[PDB]
Symmetry: C4
Subunit: 194 residues, 4 copies
Amino acid sequence: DSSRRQYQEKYKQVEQYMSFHKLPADFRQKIHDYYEHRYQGKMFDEDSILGELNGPLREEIVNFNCRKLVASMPLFANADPNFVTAMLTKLKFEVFQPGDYIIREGTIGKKMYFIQHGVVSVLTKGNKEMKLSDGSYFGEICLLTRGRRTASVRADTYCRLYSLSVDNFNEVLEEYPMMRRAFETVAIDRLDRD
Amino acid sequence: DSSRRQYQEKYKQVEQYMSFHKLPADFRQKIHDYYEHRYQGKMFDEDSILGELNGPLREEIVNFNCRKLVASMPLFANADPNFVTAMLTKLKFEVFQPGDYIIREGTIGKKMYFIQHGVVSVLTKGNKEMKLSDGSYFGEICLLTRGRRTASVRADTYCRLYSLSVDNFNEVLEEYPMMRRAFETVAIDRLDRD
Amino acid sequence: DSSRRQYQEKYKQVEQYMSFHKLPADFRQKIHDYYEHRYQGKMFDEDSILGELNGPLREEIVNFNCRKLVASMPLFANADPNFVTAMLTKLKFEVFQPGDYIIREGTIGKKMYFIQHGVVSVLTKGNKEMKLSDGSYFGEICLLTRGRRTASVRADTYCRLYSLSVDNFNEVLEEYPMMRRAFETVAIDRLDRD
Amino acid sequence: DSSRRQYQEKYKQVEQYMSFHKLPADFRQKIHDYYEHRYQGKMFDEDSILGELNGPLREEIVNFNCRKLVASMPLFANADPNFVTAMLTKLKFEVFQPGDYIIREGTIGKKMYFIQHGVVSVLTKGNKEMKLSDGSYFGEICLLTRGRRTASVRADTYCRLYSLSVDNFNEVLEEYPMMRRAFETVAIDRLDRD
Ligand SMILES: Nc1nc2c(ncn2[C@@H]2O[C@@H]3COP(=O)(O)O[C@H]3[C@H]2O)c(=O)[nH]1
Ligand SMILES: Nc1nc2c(ncn2[C@@H]2O[C@@H]3COP(=O)(O)O[C@H]3[C@H]2O)c(=O)[nH]1
Ligand SMILES: Nc1nc2c(ncn2[C@@H]2O[C@@H]3COP(=O)(O)O[C@H]3[C@H]2O)c(=O)[nH]1
Ligand SMILES: Nc1nc2c(ncn2[C@@H]2O[C@@H]3COP(=O)(O)O[C@H]3[C@H]2O)c(=O)[nH]1
């Protein structure tokens, strides 16, 4: 287990970084849990690994790892496989902890998020707290309008998300333009209930 | 043999990556063979190596390694040596396995491929399966039209190819503009038989 | 202490670099002290560390490390927290030694500096030497005019600064445009006393 | 001597790279000598080293290392020190071996070269072989015209040069526009003797 060694080795550097910058014990413990939920005691230079492979193998891997998320939402489940692949390839896996501000209402949004696992709270103003969990996405509004976030989104529980930047978003829709409607339909239904 | 060590060391990380992401035994074995045909039990940071050298040495190396491919097709064999060099420098060696989708008809193409060794099948629609092997290239159509792939291309056997992106393609033709005809002649003969 | 090892290990390479390039004993000793005041016997790949984290954790860290600087000047102390964060994220910590030319009058300026700790001398021409220390910034003039430096700025004592490039400067003001006045007010008061 | 170890360690990888690609014994020996004249048995990650420093220290280092070249040619010797520094910072040290084609007449030139040590031959067509050695530069013609190389330039002896790309060239002249005349005067005298 050299990957395991990579984790333990890397985390010790994180413990020293925190010590050097004299971070509180509360924060250090948070950092700790983050690494644990995010990496799970095993680290690999995924960029280097996948870079050693080819397109097919890479697409095959991403499709397999995201298999859960795929069948989870209609968008990818009934869509063109080549669309699904192109989209997944651009996704960035991120892990958020309870209470984190995934989206802060009022700021220029540049990313949307797909929920693989977890629950988020949506504060539009006073009281919404609408909840979103496994199988749904959020943040598509500003990717479509290029304006300010119309709401706040925080992690309720531990959230295993996949982010997509506005640029990679438009890059994919450059090839599958009709798929942009799926995101619009959702952004409209949403802006409507407000 | 430290390079050999680099390979074995790197592959073990790949074995752990796959285990962590619980990939099937069929896939793991495919990955395995890929690394074997692609690297052949020896890894070097080629980017770092060549970066330590200078232009002449680098060009000399690429010309020597691609020597086979060069004499293999008319394009490079009778062309201006400086054209041949400029072109080779931009090439990316890739290895495809039996059944892989090198090109998927209908997608916006951004790369063309030169076959050093192997055989590919060309599906234009129903039944073509035209075959291409050592000494020929494919994918130049979209590099010239900037449109969709007019056919599918899959690896029949194990394929040792060299890819060229549309940007590096136009960059070279910026200096040897007349050489663009060679690719056109082929793209026309081809679009003609359709 | 592997970080400590990283420092000692890295500094020995610096000692050999200097030896190879036969640098004077005076300079070598300066380099030495630089590493000591800048790193303090402990090195971490901060880019790699923070890259392993997420946005929230990263912002939390930068806010904590810069906490001193924040309460130190009005600009960040009474400003919008999201503005403060966005700004800090773009800051680059730098350490200058006694007598260094932080800004050389007459050159096209592209960076401004916030003083966390230290004292600087401002030569406008003959004799000014106006002094600036903890809690104030300089260099905003050219970030606003895109012209030449209107004065020279040198480190009196050892200076622990934070730099901000003109691009990252305008990027933040793209989201908090009204905050640009704070820098203008200061650039005007200053150009006025000249 | 860990730097020495870095060299020997790195060169062994180069020996294995060459073996893997079955390069001739003549070439391997050339590569060998290159590493020897270029690095001299000691390797350091200069990019990483200098990146750990600050602007002043970096400029001080480059000025010291290039001190020879500076006093060697009028251009830097009588010029504005800030011009000299800006220029040096953009220079790339390169080492050419006897018989190498530094510049190949007829190609779109993007770099000029300053000779620290060595002698080059200039073939304009039949017979020139004009020689240039320590203290002079070449290649400025295309940086000024953005056209084709008007001559060939080869290393006679072992050449220790410093290159400057057209972009970094125009970037510096953006700040010291009048200094562009120095290069013009030389490009004119030269085009004149043709
Ligand atoms: N305004 C609004 N946003 C919603 C709602 N449900 C989910 N969201 C998401 O909350 C997000 C906040 O940031 P964006 O406006 O960019 O994208 C928004 C939506 O995708 C809703 O009912 N109203
Ligand atoms: N359409 C077509 N493509 C061919 C044929 N033979 C080879 N090809 C290659 O198949 C490729 C599919 O992708 P491109 O159209 O980009 O480039 C095409 C050609 O280079 C042929 O007979 N017809
Ligand atoms: N001209 C001028 N500059 C000042 C003064 N006080 C501080 N400075 C700073 O000195 C800096 C020199 O570079 P800039 O002109 O870019 O930015 C200038 C200011 O921010 C002052 O009184 N006059
Ligand atoms: N044409 C020409 N080039 C010269 C001569 N002496 C030196 N050179 C250099 O040879 C170089 C060849 O490439 P460039 O024309 O770009 O730049 C040219 C000059 O800087 C000369 O006498 N005639």
